[PDB]
Design an enzyme around this catalytic site. Structure first.
Site, PDB file in Angstrom:
ATOM      1  N   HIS A   1      53.376   1.966  79.220  1.00  0.00           N
ATOM      2  CA  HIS A   1      52.976   2.861  78.085  1.00  0.00           C
ATOM      3  C   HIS A   1      51.604   3.424  78.153  1.00  0.00           C
ATOM      4  CE1 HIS A   1      56.947   1.799  76.278  1.00  0.00           C
ATOM      5  NE2 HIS A   1      56.200   0.758  76.086  1.00  0.00           N
TER       6      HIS A   1
ATOM      7  N   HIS B   1      42.596   0.401  74.609  1.00  0.00           N
ATOM      8  CA  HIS B   1      43.423   1.234  75.623  1.00  0.00           C
ATOM      9  C   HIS B   1      43.138   2.653  75.267  1.00  0.00           C
ATOM     10  CE1 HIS B   1      45.671   1.064  71.905  1.00  0.00           C
ATOM     11  NE2 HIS B   1      46.004   2.539  71.954  1.00  0.00           N
TER      12      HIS B   1
ATOM     13  N   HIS C   1      45.062   6.744  75.406  1.00  0.00           N
ATOM     14  CA  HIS C   1      46.018   7.918  75.521  1.00  0.00           C
ATOM     15  C   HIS C   1      45.339   9.223  76.111  1.00  0.00           C
ATOM     16  CE1 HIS C   1      48.523   5.683  72.753  1.00  0.00           C
ATOM     17  NE2 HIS C   1      47.249   5.322  72.129  1.00  0.00           N
TER      18      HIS C   1
ATOM     19  N   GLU D   1      45.419  11.962  70.652  1.00  0.00           N
ATOM     20  CA  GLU D   1      46.437  11.824  69.529  1.00  0.00           C
ATOM     21  C   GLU D   1      45.839  12.576  68.192  1.00  0.00           C
ATOM     22  OE1 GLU D   1      47.777   7.475  69.696  1.00  0.00           O
ATOM     23  OE2 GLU D   1      49.401   8.386  70.704  1.00  0.00           O
TER      24      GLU D   1
ATOM     25  N   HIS E   1      41.278   3.809  71.838  1.00  0.00           N
ATOM     26  CA  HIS E   1      41.664   2.921  70.866  1.00  0.00           C
ATOM     27  C   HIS E   1      41.186   1.564  71.136  1.00  0.00           C
ATOM     28  CE1 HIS E   1      45.068   6.066  69.577  1.00  0.00           C
ATOM     29  NE2 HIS E   1      43.941   6.251  69.234  1.00  0.00           N
TER      30      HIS E   1
ATOM     31  N   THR F   1      50.484   4.165  66.465  1.00  0.00           N
ATOM     32  CA  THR F   1      50.837   5.463  67.079  1.00  0.00           C
ATOM     33  C   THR F   1      52.055   5.455  68.019  1.00  0.00           C
ATOM     34  OG1 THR F   1      49.279   5.443  68.666  1.00  0.00           O
ATOM     35  CG2 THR F   1      48.708   6.573  66.629  1.00  0.00           C
TER      36      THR F   1
END
Ligand SMILES: COc1ccc(C[C@H]2SC(=S)NC2=O)c(OC)c1
Ligand SMILES: [Zn+2]
Length: 258
Positions: free
Chosen positions: A62, A92, A94, A104, A117, A196
């Site tokens: 992910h 991590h 996104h 996000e 994050h 999320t």
């Protein structure tokens, strides 16, 4: 659990297995900078990462997680909206397929190229698994990334990604200092929200820094070479691993700054 980011398994499907996807405090959200209100009741924010002990980097299919030793109060987040002490467990990102998407949270509907994050858990609940079951269990420090000059403190992350290309691969990642990923200012917005990704638990106090960090095009291009798939499987580039903004509903976003 077969969720992901594609057409067939992405955010618009998550509610079937995780009905809280349509809940009252979901994340991320759009931050409307004009509506967010300065809150004088917010205490000063305290990011105390000098004793942070990184251990390992993991591609989980992910994102990639940089994991810390959270067996004791090494690296902690306190202050701001928070009561008590929150211990750093992992960070991590996104990110997008192109520089115009990836974050996000959004800021007046603007999407940044990526979002970092830093995940922390409230030590009054003893362990992370217990903390995620509480409305005040987690504090996530979110930091936007724009593409411009390189971030020197990110490069050690970038350079290990070649060794964790596929889902389930990990590598030793000791002695990494997360202080090198912060911007100069700690001005922030805060609101109550959720994880999320599935399981989408409504356990997070969000602290989103106003000031993005700059990374180079070359750094983010390397994120985009990662894979969602496992070794030997058809290649699916790990890109666009972001959930869109969710309804604000009965929430206010507070600003730490005037
Ligand atoms: C069951 O506990 C979990 C599960 C998944 C994630 C990762 C999600 S939550 C977030 S915010 N961004 C993310 O990618 C958690 O945060 C690590 C916590
Ligand atoms: Zn995240």
């Amino acid at each position: 659990h077969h969720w992901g980011y594609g057409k067939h398994n992405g955010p618009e499907h998550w509610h079937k297995d995780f009905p809280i996807a349509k809940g009252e405090r979901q994340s991320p959200v759009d931050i409307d900078t004009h509506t967010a209100k300065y809150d004088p009741s917010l205490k000063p924010l305290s990011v105390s990462y000098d004793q942070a002990t990184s251990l390992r980097i993991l591609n989980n299919g992910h994102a990639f997680n940089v994991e810390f030793d959270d067996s004791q109060d090494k690296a902690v987040l306190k202050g701001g909206p928070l009561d008590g002490t929150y211990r750093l467990i992992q960070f991590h990102f996104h990110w997008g397929s192109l520089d115009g998407q990836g974050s996000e949270h959004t800021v007046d509907k603007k999407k940044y190229a990526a979002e970092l994050h830093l995940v922390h858990w409230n030590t009054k609940y003893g362990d992370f698994g217990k903390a995620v079951q509480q409305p005040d269990g987690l504090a996530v420090l979110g930091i936007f990334l724009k593409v411009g000059s390189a971030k020197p403190g990110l490069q050690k992350v970038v350079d290990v990604l070649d060794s964790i290309k596929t889902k389930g691969k990990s590598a030793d990642f000791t002695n990494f200092d997360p202080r090198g990923l912060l911007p100069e200012s700690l001005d922030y917005w805060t609101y109550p929200g959720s994880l999320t990704t599935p399981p989408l638990l409504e356990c997070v106090t969000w602290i989103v820094l106003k000031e993005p960090i700059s990374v180079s095009s070359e750094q983010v291009l390397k994120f985009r070479k990662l894979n969602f798939n496992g070794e030997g499987e058809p290649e699916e580039l790990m890109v666009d691993n972001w959930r869109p903004a969710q309804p604000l509903k009965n929430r206010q976003i507070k600003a730490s700054f005037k």
